[PDB]
Design a protein around this motif. Sequence first.
Motif, PDB file in Angstrom:
ATOM      1  N   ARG A 153      39.363 -13.412  15.565  1.00  0.00           N
ATOM      2  CA  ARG A 153      39.161 -14.651  15.307  1.00  0.00           C
ATOM      3  C   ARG A 153      38.414 -14.910  13.993  1.00  0.00           C
ATOM      4  O   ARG A 153      37.597 -14.123  13.742  1.00  0.00           O
ATOM      5  CB  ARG A 153      38.051 -15.235  16.571  1.00  0.00           C
ATOM      6  CG  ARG A 153      38.504 -14.746  18.061  1.00  0.00           C
ATOM      7  CD  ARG A 153      37.949 -15.481  19.044  1.00  0.00           C
ATOM      8  NE  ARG A 153      37.858 -14.743  20.271  1.00  0.00           N
ATOM      9  CZ  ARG A 153      39.231 -14.466  21.157  1.00  0.00           C
ATOM     10  NH1 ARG A 153      40.630 -15.032  20.687  1.00  0.00           N
ATOM     11  NH2 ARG A 153      39.056 -13.969  22.171  1.00  0.00           N
ATOM     12  N   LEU A 207      36.181 -17.865  11.951  1.00  0.00           N
ATOM     13  CA  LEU A 207      35.263 -19.056  11.344  1.00  0.00           C
ATOM     14  C   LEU A 207      35.389 -19.481  10.086  1.00  0.00           C
ATOM     15  O   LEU A 207      34.680 -18.791   9.031  1.00  0.00           O
ATOM     16  CB  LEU A 207      33.865 -18.653  11.976  1.00  0.00           C
ATOM     17  CG  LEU A 207      33.780 -18.890  13.315  1.00  0.00           C
ATOM     18  CD1 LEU A 207      34.613 -18.015  14.034  1.00  0.00           C
ATOM     19  CD2 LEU A 207      32.064 -18.467  13.778  1.00  0.00           C
ATOM     20  N   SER A 227      31.980 -20.407   8.300  1.00  0.00           N
ATOM     21  CA  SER A 227      31.019 -19.680   7.910  1.00  0.00           C
ATOM     22  C   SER A 227      31.777 -18.451   7.331  1.00  0.00           C
ATOM     23  O   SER A 227      30.937 -17.634   6.840  1.00  0.00           O
ATOM     24  CB  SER A 227      30.335 -19.010   9.269  1.00  0.00           C
ATOM     25  OG  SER A 227      29.533 -20.392   9.931  1.00  0.00           O
ATOM     26  N   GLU A 243      35.579 -11.536  13.665  1.00  0.00           N
ATOM     27  CA  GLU A 243      35.315 -10.643  14.611  1.00  0.00           C
ATOM     28  C   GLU A 243      36.815 -10.253  15.110  1.00  0.00           C
ATOM     29  O   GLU A 243      37.587 -10.939  15.520  1.00  0.00           O
ATOM     30  CB  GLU A 243      34.588 -10.991  15.638  1.00  0.00           C
ATOM     31  CG  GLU A 243      35.316 -11.964  16.738  1.00  0.00           C
ATOM     32  CD  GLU A 243      34.045 -12.420  17.931  1.00  0.00           C
ATOM     33  OE1 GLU A 243      33.031 -12.090  17.878  1.00  0.00           O
ATOM     34  OE2 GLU A 243      34.572 -12.945  19.067  1.00  0.00           O
ATOM     35  N   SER A 299      38.032  -7.869  18.523  1.00  0.00           N
ATOM     36  CA  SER A 299      37.774  -7.759  19.657  1.00  0.00           C
ATOM     37  C   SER A 299      38.805  -7.101  20.351  1.00  0.00           C
ATOM     38  O   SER A 299      40.078  -7.291  20.368  1.00  0.00           O
ATOM     39  CB  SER A 299      37.245  -8.858  20.305  1.00  0.00           C
ATOM     40  OG  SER A 299      38.212  -9.898  20.412  1.00  0.00           O
ATOM     41  N   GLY A 358      37.622  -7.915  25.033  1.00  0.00           N
ATOM     42  CA  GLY A 358      36.175  -8.667  25.034  1.00  0.00           C
ATOM     43  C   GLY A 358      35.042  -7.630  24.637  1.00  0.00           C
ATOM     44  O   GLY A 358      34.023  -7.719  25.009  1.00  0.00           O
ATOM     45  N   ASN A 359      35.359  -6.729  23.773  1.00  0.00           N
ATOM     46  CA  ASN A 359      34.220  -6.023  23.162  1.00  0.00           C
ATOM     47  C   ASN A 359      34.510  -5.996  21.717  1.00  0.00           C
ATOM     48  O   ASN A 359      35.605  -5.880  21.189  1.00  0.00           O
ATOM     49  CB  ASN A 359      34.345  -4.591  23.778  1.00  0.00           C
ATOM     50  CG  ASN A 359      33.942  -4.283  25.237  1.00  0.00           C
ATOM     51  OD1 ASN A 359      34.351  -5.307  25.994  1.00  0.00           O
ATOM     52  ND2 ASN A 359      33.348  -3.402  25.388  1.00  0.00           N
ATOM     53  N   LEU A 360      33.271  -6.244  21.041  1.00  0.00           N
ATOM     54  CA  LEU A 360      33.146  -6.320  19.535  1.00  0.00           C
ATOM     55  C   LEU A 360      33.400  -4.862  18.958  1.00  0.00           C
ATOM     56  O   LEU A 360      33.208  -3.770  19.420  1.00  0.00           O
ATOM     57  CB  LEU A 360      31.804  -6.850  19.089  1.00  0.00           C
ATOM     58  CG  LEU A 360      31.947  -7.252  17.694  1.00  0.00           C
ATOM     59  CD1 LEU A 360      32.665  -8.282  17.651  1.00  0.00           C
ATOM     60  CD2 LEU A 360      30.231  -7.364  17.134  1.00  0.00           C
TER      61      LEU A 360
END
Lengths: 48, 48
Positions: free
Chosen positions: A4, A6, A9, A13, A15, A18-20
């Motif tokens: 994903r 941003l 900014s 990230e 993933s 669902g874990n970084l």
Amino acid sequence: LEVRLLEASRAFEVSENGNLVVSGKVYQWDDPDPRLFDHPESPTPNPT
Amino acid sequence: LEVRLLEASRAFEVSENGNLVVSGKVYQWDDPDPRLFDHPESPTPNPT
């Protein structure tokens, strides 16, 4: 792997289930400078 | 206004026309504690 961005900014990230995994800032280089990729003089002459 | 969430990093971002306006962290409060809202010891015990 799901990544994903941003844009405002300049952050991303990566993933996995669902874990970084990775995190940091990625953005375009507006004005590339070829001089950045000139090989710095080595501290050791290594003449032989 | 555009709101983006990063679940892995628990980070959010609000932007207006591509200009960042608000950034921070957000996540569901797993185990709320009602003690957290008990009114704190008053700075002035007896204003009278």
